[PDB]
Amino acid sequence: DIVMTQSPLTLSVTIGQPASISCKSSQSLLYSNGKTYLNWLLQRPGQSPKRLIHLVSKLDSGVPDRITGSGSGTDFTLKISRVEAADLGVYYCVQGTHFPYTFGGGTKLEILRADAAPTVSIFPPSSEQLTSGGASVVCFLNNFYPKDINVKWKIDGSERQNGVLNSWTDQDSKDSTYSMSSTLTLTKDEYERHNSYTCEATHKTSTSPIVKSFNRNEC
Amino acid sequence: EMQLQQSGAELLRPGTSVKLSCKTSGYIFTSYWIHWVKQRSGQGLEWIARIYPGTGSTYYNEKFKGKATLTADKSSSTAYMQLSTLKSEDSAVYFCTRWGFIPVREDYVMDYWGQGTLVTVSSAKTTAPSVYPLAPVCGDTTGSSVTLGCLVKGYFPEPVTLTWNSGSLSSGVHTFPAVLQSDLYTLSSSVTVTSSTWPSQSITCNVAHPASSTKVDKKIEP
Ligand SMILES: C[C@@H](NC(=O)CCCP(=O)(O)Oc1ccc([N+](=O)[O-])cc1)C(=O)O
Ligand SMILES: [Zn+2]
Ligand SMILES: [Zn+2]
Ligand SMILES: [Zn+2]
Ligand SMILES: [Zn+2]
Ligand SMILES: [Zn+2]
Ligand SMILES: [Zn+2]
Numbered sequence: 502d503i504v505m506t507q508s509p510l511t512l513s514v515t516i517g518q519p520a521s522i523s524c525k526s527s528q529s530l531l532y533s534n535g536k537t538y539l540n541w542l543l544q545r546p547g548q549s550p551k552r553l554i555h556l557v558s559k560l561d562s563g564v565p566d567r568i569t570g571s572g573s574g575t576d577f578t579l580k581i582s583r584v585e586a587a588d589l590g591v592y593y594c595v596q597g598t599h600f601p602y603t604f605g606g607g608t609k610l611e612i613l614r615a616d617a618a619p620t621v622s623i624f625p626p627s628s629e630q631l632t633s634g635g636a637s638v639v640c641f642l643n644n645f646y647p648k649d650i651n652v653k654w655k656i657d658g659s660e661r662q663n664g665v666l667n668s669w670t671d672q673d674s675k676d677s678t679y680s681m682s683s684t685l686t687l688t689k690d691e692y693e694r695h696n697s698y699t700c701e702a703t704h705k706t707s708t709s710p711i712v713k714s715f716n717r718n719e720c
Numbered sequence: 721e722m723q724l725q726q727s728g729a730e731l732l733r734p735g736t737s738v739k740l741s742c743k744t745s746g747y748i749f750t751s752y753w754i755h756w757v758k759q760r761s762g763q764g765l766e767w768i769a770r771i772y773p774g775t776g777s778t779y780y781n782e783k784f785k786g787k788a789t790l791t792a793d794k795s796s797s798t799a800y801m802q803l804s805t806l807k808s809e810d811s812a813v814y815f816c817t818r819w820g821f822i823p824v825r826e827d828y829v830m831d832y833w834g835q836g837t838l839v840t841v842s843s844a845k846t847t848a849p850s851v852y853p854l855a856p857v858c859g860d861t862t863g864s865s866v867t868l869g870c871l872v873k874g875y876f877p878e879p880v881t882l883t884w885n886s887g888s889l890s891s892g893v894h895t896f897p898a899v900l901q902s903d904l905y906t907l908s909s910s911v912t913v914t915s916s917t918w919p920s921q922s923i924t925c926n927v928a929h930p931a932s933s934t935k936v937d938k939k940i941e942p
């Protein structure tokens with residue numbers, strides 16, 4: 502099978518700047534009829550893939566001409582002259598010259614925007630949950646950039662690594678920021694035995710950790 | 721308007737098989753090749769096979785002979801893909817597409833794709849979710865704007881549908897991808913509104929889990 506190699510794996514570009522993705526094949530993509538069947542697809546977050554280019558450089562209908570493709574043989578390039586927010590997603594080169602048709606591993610394009618500090622909100626367990634004998638403390642870290650962030654949970658001053666469940670959203674096409682949720686789950690019994698619950702984050706936007714906490718007591 | 725609609729998510733037991741459907745409309749079904757593509761863990765696409773509904777002619781990627789069987793019902797304009805004896809590697813999202821390459825013109829017409837069908841191969845039991853409201857105490861963010869949340873935990877399998885105020889409230893909503901742990905998924909969503917809206921007007925979290933026929937509404941009370 503033809504091996505298709507894409508580089509870079511990810512590229513961070515600011516709106517208005519050019520971008521180019523490379524695709525290399527293990528065999529020449531020149532078909533015996535003189536045509537080169539190399540296509541480029543774009544898969545936007547939560548959408549099905551869509552073909553942008555066919556036959557190396559021909560644009561499909563409805564595709565903006567800010568997108569161009571070039572190359573021959575084993576080397577191909579997709580270029581975006583001026584990046585827009587709508588270009589966010591994963592780009593793939595796919596060949597149809599040799600059977601079976603094979604895909605490149607994909608290149609994720611992300612919109613480079615200004616640094617943004619997370620807005621943190623912490624939530625104690627609901628009565629509903631406590632009744633069942635469980636207790637989850639939730640911490641939402643919204644709209645930050647870059648995506649690089651480290652969250653730690655501290656209960657009464659010491660780090661708690663077990664029972665943590667994290668999840669990140671993909672980059673938002675409205676403001677180019679990321680969001681993350683961190684949930685610490687304990688038993689109701691252990692929850693009522695501690696006092697302070699701290700959600701602590703490390704991020705480029707601050708020299709000191711970003712803190713959010715609460716103290717559970719009574720009244 | 722050319723459209724392809726695929727069947728819903730499937731939970732399949734190891735060793736059994738499934739038949740996925742791809743219902744088309746808006747074009748002459750018999751005149752175009754329909755292709756099936758597989759997607760594993762995010763970025764990782766593989767071409768499976770293609771069928772020309774007009775004649776029933778199919779071509780398969782070697783890796784999938786015996787695994788996939790493509791058929792087409794001309795009377796309902798539906799393409800089908802049967803996957804046999806399922807195992808670990810078969811858990812993926814499968815897409816059908818009227819790719820558009822016209823072999824005789826050596827050129828292409830627009831590609832249309834189905835929304836994709838997620839197949840989960842597991843023997844774990846179906847479990848209804850527990851939905852918990854998240855009212856602020858420190859996650860109030862002071863005045864100006866306040867963020868509420870909804871915790872959906874302990875369910876299997878995916879997907880779960882979470883909307884706020886039946887869909888009315890869509891701005892300022894963040895729904896996080898479900899994460900699996902100990903055979904159960906956990907999912908959460910946050911909504912940011914202004915101090916004036918809440919608690920004044922109510923905010924409700926609507927959760928649906930088709931696999932277990934669970935439909936629950938949780939109001940975020942102070
Ligand atoms: C020798 C041979 N090849 C051809 O006839 C050319 C097919 C080019 P196409 O862009 O349609 O390949 C693709 C690329 C990709 C996909 N896809 O991603 O679905 C489908 C089709 C053959 O099939 O017998
Ligand atoms: Zn070949
Ligand atoms: Zn050959
Ligand atoms: Zn202690
Ligand atoms: Zn102590
Ligand atoms: Zn303690
Ligand atoms: Zn103590």
Ligand SMILES: [Zn+2]
Pocket residue numbers: 555559827828
């Ligand atoms: Zn063309």
